[PDB]
Amino acid sequence: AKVGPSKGRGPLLAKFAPVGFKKGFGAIGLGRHTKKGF
Amino acid sequence: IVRIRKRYMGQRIEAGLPPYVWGGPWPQWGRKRSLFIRGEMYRRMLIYSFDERRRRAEKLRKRRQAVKWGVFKLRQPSVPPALTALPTYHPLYPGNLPK
Amino acid sequence: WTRASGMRNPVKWTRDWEVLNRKVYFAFDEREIRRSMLDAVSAHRKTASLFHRMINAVPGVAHAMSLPGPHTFFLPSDKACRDHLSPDSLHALTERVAFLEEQQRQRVGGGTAAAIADRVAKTTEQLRTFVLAHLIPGEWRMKTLLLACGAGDPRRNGSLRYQDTDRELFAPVMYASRLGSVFLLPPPQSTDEPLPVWVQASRYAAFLPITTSTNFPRRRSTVGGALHLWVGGALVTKGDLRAHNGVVHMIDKPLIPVQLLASP
Amino acid sequence: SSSYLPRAATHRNRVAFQLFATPREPTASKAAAAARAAAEAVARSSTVSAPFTVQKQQRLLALLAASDLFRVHGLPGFSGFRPSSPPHLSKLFRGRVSRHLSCRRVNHLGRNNSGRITVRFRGAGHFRRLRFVDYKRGRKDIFGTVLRLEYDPNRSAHLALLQYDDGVLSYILATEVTRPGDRVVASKHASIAPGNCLPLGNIPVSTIVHNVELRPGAGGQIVRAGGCYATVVAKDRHFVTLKLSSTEVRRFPADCWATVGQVSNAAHAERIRGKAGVSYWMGERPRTRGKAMNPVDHPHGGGTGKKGLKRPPVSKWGILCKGYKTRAKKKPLGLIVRRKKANKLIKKF
Amino acid sequence: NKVRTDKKERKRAFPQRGFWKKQNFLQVKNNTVRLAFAVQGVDLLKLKRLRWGEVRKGNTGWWTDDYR
Amino acid sequence: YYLPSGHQPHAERQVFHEGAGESPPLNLWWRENRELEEAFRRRLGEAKCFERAFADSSEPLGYTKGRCRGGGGKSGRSVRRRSKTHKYRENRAF
Amino acid sequence: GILRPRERLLLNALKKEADIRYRGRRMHKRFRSWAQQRVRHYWLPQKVCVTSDPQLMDGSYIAACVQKAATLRKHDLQLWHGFSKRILELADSLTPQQMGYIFYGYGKSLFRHEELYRGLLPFVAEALPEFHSHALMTVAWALERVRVNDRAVVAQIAEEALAKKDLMRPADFIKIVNCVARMGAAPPSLAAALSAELMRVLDEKCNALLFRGAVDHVAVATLYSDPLRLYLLERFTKTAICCRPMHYQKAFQSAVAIRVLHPPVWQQLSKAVRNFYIRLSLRRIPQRARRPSPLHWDVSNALAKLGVFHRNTFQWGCFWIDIGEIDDRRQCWFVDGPSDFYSSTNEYTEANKLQHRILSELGWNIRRVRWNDWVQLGTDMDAKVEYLRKLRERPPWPAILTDGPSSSRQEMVANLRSARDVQRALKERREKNRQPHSLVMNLG
Amino acid sequence: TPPKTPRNVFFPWQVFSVHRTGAFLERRRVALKVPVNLTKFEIQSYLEKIYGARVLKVSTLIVVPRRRRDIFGPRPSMRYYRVGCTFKKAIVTLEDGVPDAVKMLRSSIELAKNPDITKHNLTYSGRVRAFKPPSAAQRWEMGESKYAWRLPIPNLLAGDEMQLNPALRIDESTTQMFPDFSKPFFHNAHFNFSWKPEEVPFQQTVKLDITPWRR
Amino acid sequence: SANPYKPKSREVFHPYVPAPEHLPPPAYTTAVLKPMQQFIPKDFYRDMRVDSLRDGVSLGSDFPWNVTHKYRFWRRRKYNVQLDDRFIRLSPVTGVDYYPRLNVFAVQWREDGQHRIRWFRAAYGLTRAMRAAENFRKTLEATGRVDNWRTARHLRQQMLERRQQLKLRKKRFAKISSGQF
RNA sequence: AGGAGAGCGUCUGUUGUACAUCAACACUAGAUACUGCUAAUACCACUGUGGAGGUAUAGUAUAUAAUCCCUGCCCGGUGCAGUAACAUGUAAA
RNA sequence: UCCUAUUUCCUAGUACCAUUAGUGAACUCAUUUGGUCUGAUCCUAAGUACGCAGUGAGCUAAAUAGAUACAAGGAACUUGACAAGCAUUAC
RNA sequence: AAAGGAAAGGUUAACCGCUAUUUAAACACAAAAAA
RNA sequence: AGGUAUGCAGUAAAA
RNA sequence: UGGUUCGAAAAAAAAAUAAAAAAAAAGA
RNA sequence: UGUAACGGUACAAGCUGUAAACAAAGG
């Protein structure tokens, strides 16, 4: 295949995805998103 | 000819001679007034930034002036709102008219 | 698919400067406004309380000001009225506006009663004349007024284009070597005298060369900007309050008609 | 369509009320007294009681016909484009429809919930807004002033912005003689003047009406298109007979409300488009003929070179479409007194 | 690509007479590196040109041998 | 029904046709009290443009609809009826 | 859908202008952080209603209510005077934690009720052995902010902090030292002890964010010892990257004070550190808007009527000058208001004295106006002109600023009320003078 | 993947190791390999509590080793693999310097790979044109005023250690001779600011003639 | 194309930009500028020099250099130079245009209602082609082959052949005007 | 791709990507037929959806088409309409 | 005591993830030199005060694809003016 | 004329909602209840 | 003509 | 500077991810 | 249950879970 985990690509990451994809690595949470992007 | 002129001007730059240029008639190679159009755009951007700064200053000043000693107060309506609420039998009271 | 926005807007706008100039024209001169002149007046009611009250309390004035015909309204402020009107005139105006509002409220709810109709008619006519003395045919925007007064004309804009000051008196640390045309607008709807308009240089103009690159050749009001626009002896404080059917210009003095003025 | 308010709000077979009341008085008894006073005032003001006919409409139209500073100074507009008339002279408002009385139109593009095309030959067209027009005239015994007349892209007639005496704004269908500054009212005591809304039982014979309710209080449904109108033929205690624009004679309950006059914009039919592009803007798509297709695609298709229909005309679905009746035979006529015949027969007899 | 998943090997199955050398770009890059080293007192080009076991201090060479 | 703000009730209007009687001043009875204003606004919001009729078996004269009088079908198309192995879960489970 | 060509063009132009407006709007937001921190580990887990009747409140409830009101900016005079009455009733039954929270609320809200602090301080002194770091810090902090000066009690608080050094929080100790320096309450032995402890606290317990709070020019000039001065000035060069304009300003003022009054220490610094501060002197350190006060404006008006050219509220070096004359630039004036002294006294603040001495030694001829004397002139202009002329006819003030006569809280309150009345009258008769009032309408 | 950090640790398992970079790092900066799930606050607290380091800033990147295909050796299996592990590269800026020989790589075999020597004059990637934001001194707020060298206090602090006149820092081998202001010359030679000195005479403003045919 | 939707005026527009309608007076208006009594607030010049550009008329004696801060353009600014005002490919002779894809100078005119165009290849030389186009246009004008530039003599001369053609048409349709057929 | 003409389509358009760019299709308009609203017609889970939140100057179906003059005769046949069924009507059916 | 008020208000170090900020279809595709050339726009340009890019060697045969120049004749060619030709030529 | 944006947020207004709320950061400063 | 810097609810008006 | 986050607006779910771990006695 | 992703381990088709091959000798 040309998209996906095939050919050694593995699971998707924000580095390999378009802007808008949300995926972290396991960090703890330290706060709250506001209603205005903060 | 462009190559020759560039060589000469670069030679003067390297030598450190004064930054003089040929003064004669420069032909106009373009049609658009990009300089002035871009200047107008920059003017508009600067005005917008100034407006944002004014808005911020007014926001903070309004909050802080609202919270001042001798100005801020805790108040409630003089006449209890229970006395001024609509009686349950009022025609405009919810459920008292056909829908 | 993308969620880039803001400074990373994926929209491929044109870079052609001529097209962008046309866009400027369409976005500023040909912009469409939904609200009306009375909408703007209500938005500024807190600063123009007296005129808002008159517009809402005098019969016919709201109808006249809500008509489609492109109009220009010069709105005085309560501060302007208080400063320029005599105390008795201000008291009379407030009392009569309150009287009209009170009669309206009575409607919501001998000879002595008969005189009420005459007084109402008199007050309505006088206040309608006063309010409509500020309504002018056509839409006269601020830049149009300035260009009509001559600002922007290279032959006439002298005394407004090269203002300078004694710099060393105000920015001394940078000057060690020195340390040693009346346009006429159509008459108000309630009068026949056309309105004079002129321009002057503000006190802030002289300080521009201190902080800007210049290419020169060989009490005072605190309103901002480099140019001041005067209409009928009154200064424009906030202009280009555009609407769908006209424009509102805020002024610092009421334009009382000669008929309502007192000769002695 | 059903993409607006939900079924629970839109569907109600039996409406239990005909007067949308908005009383101001503190108690029900005082509200009733005020309603009686308002009805009596409307009755006192009402003076016209004669029928409103085609000839009276023509006379009013004739009377209405018989009876440089205003611009944006210093504003050089487009090089070629200009409005047909300035705002202070155009018949219509020239402005924008009220935002609080309209919403964006959901364009189904001729496709149903299945996603297939059910209504053929539909195109995107120009963006449109649906505006909330009061087909009910629910507010009774309160006078309103027509402030302006407005274009409607979904409707063949013109709309009128009505401001009630208490400040309420609404949109109603405009009559052929409706002009700014007109005073209108809905009541049984109202005079017989164009724009007024009355029960069909209080409108004299020969009068011309529009926006007729099939069920009392459910909002007018009959005679809405521009220039259309219906005529009052006969009246009895319970029913009133109307002749409709289709030449159909039908009875209506005497309690169904209606508005006096003809529907505005009677010149709609006179419009000439001039090019395919105008219909393209209006929202049409090309219509391919049945006989231009292959036999698998239409009954009329097939045949070397051009040919005739080769049979009595039928649609894509095999139904005769010239003279073949489609109304259900068993469906009762109900209040229909007589239904029109073919136009050829009508014009030849 | 480095993982050899593309089809770039298809063209390499056909002969070509030659290939561009990009010498202008490569020389600009090389001279940038040389300047970065030289501002600190390093003669990278001299080091690269030295013969095996050859020692030349400063800016010296066969001409220094000739005149000394 | 839309009720504009009490500080600007006057909507934009065209020029009144000649001879039209002067409109009386607006009666803003709903500005005496904020509670009255809110009640009136909610009452106005309760209004509806129209009420629609629909098939309902609870009504004595209700009815439903079948297919067209002629009884034909789209030319060249052999429509397959829905089944549990055809259009099984379109728009709803059952 | 499609649009008519005019509509297409107008909306397209609107979109372009919106994009450009956004770009212009975001231009100056260099110091706008989408990630922001909020402090909440001081909020108590108990719930309270601030308007509850005070007579039902105890220390634990009233302290929490005061702190919550201060956090929520519910600055109501009646509410806070009820707080004062109830707290004075409950003075006998407050723990150090409750007293600390009360002082925090009062200082944070800047509620200048001197009587409450005066009545609560004796119990603070008595209960000092049981106090903890936060409570000591808060008492000192509130007193410094509101200008309530009690040197004996402040010194006792500092001594208690020294005794509990092993338990004190570094930030609390730094704040206590700064407050002691600003209030001028430490004799030489206490100053030496505090400097010795602060040296170790900063070297062992404070990272950059905690250390930057120790950079205060008043403490450097009047309190810190020479080794502490050297260590602080050296460490600021390392910790500058994490600092803000206030920290930079105080570091610059400290360097100038050391250079002007301690040339030996300035020389004992190293060349690299001196270079750092020389380069700091060249930077544009963001100040904040300052404007003449009503008293400042009155003095300026009287001076102008006298006929002396002058300029107001300008920055020279790392100082702000109230009035700077134009004809003779070295002549300057300072208008001293109620907050320039300690409450109920005419004693100048340490910052004011330090600024006076530094400017005097750098060459300025300073003259000073006291509001206590100015208020007695009233609205008269001839009297004020004569006052300023007589002050001008006399020599400048010494490099050491001496305190004025004795006063009392009664006289302070009386003078504040008189100043209020004078402000009102002057504003009224300024605006009335501005108003023309010349249009007369024949409407009647 | 890595276990989430508890509120109280008592026994940290995270390994912070020094990373030898082939790129350039400043004097007071050091690069560390760290577990991917740690935050900047966690890293700073870890370093300040376990080592006592005085950390000023932490910057983070996520490094994923690139895909590699086994294609070369005899009997090659054309399978994909990654060398090393995914990790967080934490660049820590401290109060004191860190040795270059520690933080960066060196080589006498490939003479071009000496980042400690080449510094930021080279980009160590495919980047051709280096992007650098304006410096703090170049900014306006907390920036260096271009006329502060003439003020009294800076000159009082300078003493004999520093000379503040910018004329003394002019590079003779780069600047050109002063021209006559009355004759054609370039602005970029000696002005180095965005305005026109008054000593330059009045300049002619030329507006394009877009419709010559009309006249 | 000469659209009907382009703006009428071809000038560079500087619209009046009003501030949000409810902002109070800006900070720099509090300054006191009496020489005897001075107070210059913070950011006075920064705020005022940008507020002055609002009206769109007083753009500054050095516009747009007073709002152009980027050094990219200042590095290119020259002094005491004389500049042309006309794009080199524009001709003052009406009807002369340039087609760049074809590399030709075109002369477009109207002659007897018809719209006609002729090409002049520029590969022989830009100046030569442009001058050939201008000479052709002027020759057409002089000989009266451009309708709008014709003279009374040209109109009279052309009317003769117009008359001949009209008589031919009359003979063509003679049988209809007489009443036969 | 000029001047003078004829044929076919009025025209601007669509069009078979990769053998058909055409006289083929569409088109502005004139007609006819159906449809009184839970309208007809379409989709064919059918108290549902599009039609349409529209209402006979509307919607749907089938021809012929834009401008001018014209558009003859036939209801015997087939279909449709009409009636209890007839009679009778309807061809731009 | 003539400013529309003479109204305290700088940047709290800052969660997680993306980015090689330039030339360049840089995408789908693959006879894939990534980058030059093949088109508008983007810097008041003597081509933007020396920029970006430049691929083994030989050799007079014809034939082919083109480019230029063709005496006199001028469509006699061809199914058909297809293809060509004109639209440069004292200055 | 083919008849065109209004959800969240900011501004102004209104407001008897609430730590689901602006540093235990700092600067400035004639300033304020009751009696 | 998406949302800008104490933040959650919440009504109206609008370049 | 963007994503994230509120809205558009979506279980119309990007496996190994989160303001997202049993959810206030939190011990200030 | 089964499988897989990352991480550790000879950078692995094995083993294994941040204790990532080993505790067996504790009031």
**Of G353, G291, G347, G15, the residue nearest G148 (C-alpha):** G347
- Cβ of I58 within 8 Å of Cβ of C227? The answer is yes
Q: Which nucleotides of J are covered by protein (CB under 7 A)?
A: 3, 11-12, 24-29, 32-66, 78-82, 89-91, 93
Q: Which nucleotides of N are covered by protein (CB under 7 A)?
A: 1-6, 14-21, 24-26, 28
The encoded tokens of residue C239 equal 């202009």
Burial class (CB in 10 A: 0-12, 13-18, 19+), C56: buried
**Of I11, D76, H209, the residue nearest B36 (C-alpha):** I11
Asked whether the beta carbons of C61 and C54 are under 8 A apart, the reply is yes
* DSSP code at position G240: G
SS3 D267: coil
CA-CA distances (angstroms) from residue B32 to G177, H207, H210, I8? 67, 10, 9, 17
Q: At what angle do helices G133-146 and G170-183 cross, to 10 degrees?
A: 30
> Is the CB of residue A18 less than 8 Å away from at least one CB of chain C?
yes
Residue type, D66: A
Whether nucleic acid strand K comes within 7 Å of the CB of E18, the answer is: yes
Residues of F in contact with D114 (CB under 8 A): 90-91
Q: At what angle do helices G151-163 and G133-146 cross, to 10 degrees?
A: 160
Nucleotide closest to H84 measured between CA and C1': O11
> Is the CB of residue H202 less than 8 Å away from at least one CB of chain C?
yes
Nucleotide closest to H37 measured between CA and C1': K16
Whether nucleic acid strand M comes within 7 Å of the CB of C28, the answer is: yes
Pairing of the two strands D183-184 and H87-94: unpaired
- To 5 degrees, how large is the angle CA D196–CA D197–CA D198? 120
Nucleotide closest to D102 measured between CA and C1': L6
Asked whether the beta carbons of G54 and G82 are under 8 A apart, the reply is yes
Q: How far is C258 from chain H (nearest CA, A)?
A: 48
**Of G325, G392, G326, G320, the residue nearest G356 (C-alpha):** G320
SS3 G87: helix
* Within A 15-34, residues with CB less than 7 Å from strand K: 15, 19, 23-25, 27, 29-31, 33
How far is H38 from H59, CA to CA, in rounded Å? 12
Residue type, D301: G
Which pairs count as long-range contacts for C51-58, CB under 8 Å and 24+ apart, including other chains?
A: C51/C75, C51/C76, C51/C131, C52/F7, C53/C97, C53/C101, C54/C97, C54/C127, C54/C130, C54/C131, C55/C131, C56/F7, C57/C97, C57/C100, C57/C101, C57/C104, C57/C127, C58/C100, C58/C124, C58/C127, C58/C128, C58/C131
Place of tokens 């100005």: B71
Nucleotide closest to A20 measured between CA and C1': N3
How far is G147 from H115, CA to CA, in rounded Å? 57
Phi and psi, residue C229, nearest 5° = -105, 120
- Cβ of B92 within 8 Å of Cβ of F33? The answer is no
The encoded tokens of residue G44 equal 């108590």
How far is C215 from I59, CA to CA, in rounded Å? 12
CA-CA distances (angstroms) from residue G341 to G144, G404, I156? 12, 10, 105
How far is C191 from H76, CA to CA, in rounded Å? 101
- Cβ of C17 within 8 Å of Cβ of B37? The answer is yes
D280-CA/J44-C1' distance, Å: 31
CA-CA distances (angstroms) from residue G383 to B21, G301, G308? 68, 13, 16
Select the residue of H38, H64, H69 nearest A27 (Cβ to Cβ): H38
Burial class (CB in 10 A: 0-12, 13-18, 19+), G27: middle
How far is G64 from C10, CA to CA, in rounded Å? 52
> Is the CB of residue I4 less than 8 Å away from at least one CB of chain D?
yes
Q: How far is D82 from chain I (nearest CA, A)?
A: 9
**Of D164, D168, D170, the residue nearest D143 (C-alpha):** D164
* DSSP code at position G56: G
CA-CA distances (angstroms) from residue G183 to C198, G187, G401, I104? 60, 12, 16, 88
Residue type, H103: K
DSSP assignment of G348-382:
BPHHHHHHHHHHHHHT-EEEEEEHHHHGGGTT-HH
> Is the CB of residue C6 less than 8 Å away from at least one CB of chain G?
yes
Residue type, G327: D
- Cβ of I5 within 8 Å of Cβ of D78? The answer is yes
SS3 H50: helix
**Of D51, D58, D56, D96, the residue nearest D266 (C-alpha):** D58
Query: Partners for E (CB, 8 Å, 3+ pairs)?
Result: A, H
DSSP assignment of D300-341:
T---SS----SSS-B-TTS-B-SS---S-SSS--TTEEE---
The encoded tokens of residue H26 equal 């400043």
Asked whether the beta carbons of I52 and C205 are under 8 A apart, the reply is yes
Burial class (CB in 10 A: 0-12, 13-18, 19+), B55: middle
Q: Which residue is nearest to nucleotide K46 (CA to C1')?
A: B26
Whether nucleic acid strand O comes within 7 Å of the CB of H14, the answer is: yes
CA-CA distances (angstroms) from residue G181 to E25, F29, G144, G354? 65, 68, 10, 12
Pairing of the two strands C71-76 and B25-28: unpaired
**Of D114, B7, H148, the residue nearest G282 (C-alpha):** H148
Query: Partners for D (CB, 8 Å, 3+ pairs)?
Result: B, C, F, G, I
**Of D83, D259, D285, the residue nearest D174 (C-alpha):** D259
Mutate which of B22, B32, B41, B46 to test chain I, going by most I C-beta atoms within 10 A?
B46
SS3 G84: helix
How far is C219 from C209, CA to CA, in rounded Å? 23
**Of D221, H126, C84, the residue nearest G434 (C-alpha):** C84
CB atoms within 10 A of CB C174: 14
How far is G318 from G313, CA to CA, in rounded Å? 13
How far is G65 from G50, CA to CA, in rounded Å? 5
Residues contacting G75, CB < 8 A, separation 6+: B67, B68, B69, B72, G69, G109, G111
Which H helix or E strand runs over C135?
A: strand C135-137
**Of D131, D150, D170, the residue nearest D20 (C-alpha):** D170
Rg of chain C (C-alpha set): 24
Asked whether the beta carbons of A38 and G35 are under 8 A apart, the reply is yes
SS3 A33: coil
* DSSP code at position G242: G
How far is B21 from B5, CA to CA, in rounded Å? 11
The encoded tokens of residue G387 equal 């006052």
Burial class (CB in 10 A: 0-12, 13-18, 19+), C70: buried
How far is C95 from C54, CA to CA, in rounded Å? 11
The resolution in angstroms reads 2.2
> Is the CB of residue G3 less than 8 Å away from at least one CB of chain D?
yes
DSSP assignment of H115-146:
HHHHGGGS-SSS--S---PPPTTTSSTTPBPT
**Of G289, I48, D291, the residue nearest C222 (C-alpha):** I48
A36-CA/N8-C1' distance, Å: 15
Place of tokens 């009677």: D266
**Of H180, H179, H178, H184, the residue nearest H204 (C-alpha):** H184
Which H helix or E strand runs over D143?
A: none
How far is C136 from D70, CA to CA, in rounded Å? 10
Q: How far is C184 from chain G (nearest CA, A)?
A: 23
First-last CA distance in chain H? 77
How many beta-carbon pairs below 8 A join chains C and D?
Answer: 44
Residue type, C143: K
The encoded tokens of residue D17 equal 């009320």
Residue of chain E whose Cα is closest to the Cα of A7 = E5
Residue of chain C whose Cα is closest to the Cα of A17 = C2
Residue type, A4: G
Bridge partners (DSSP) listed for residue G348: G341
Which pairs count as long-range contacts for D47-51, CB under 8 Å and 24+ apart, including other chains?
A: D47/D191, D48/D191, D48/D192, D48/D193, D49/D191, D49/D192, D49/D204, D50/D192, D50/D204, D51/D192, D51/D203, D51/D204, D51/D205, D51/D206, D51/D207, D51/D232
CA-CA distances (angstroms) from residue H17 to H30, H32, H34? 11, 5, 7
Residues contacting H67, CB < 8 A, separation 6+: A7, A8, A9, E2, E3, H80, H81, H82
How far is E44 from E36, CA to CA, in rounded Å? 10
Pairing of the two strands H17-18 and H29-34: antiparallel
Residues of D in contact with C137 (CB under 8 A): 69-70
* DSSP code at position G393: T
**Of A38, A32, C5, the residue nearest G34 (C-alpha):** A38
Asked whether the beta carbons of G62 and G90 are under 8 A apart, the reply is yes
How many beta-carbon pairs below 8 A join chains B and F?
Answer: 16
**Of G398, G415, G417, the residue nearest G407 (C-alpha):** G415
How far is D190 from D203, CA to CA, in rounded Å? 10
Nucleotide closest to C239 measured between CA and C1': M15
Residues contacting G298, CB < 8 A, separation 6+: G374, G384, G426
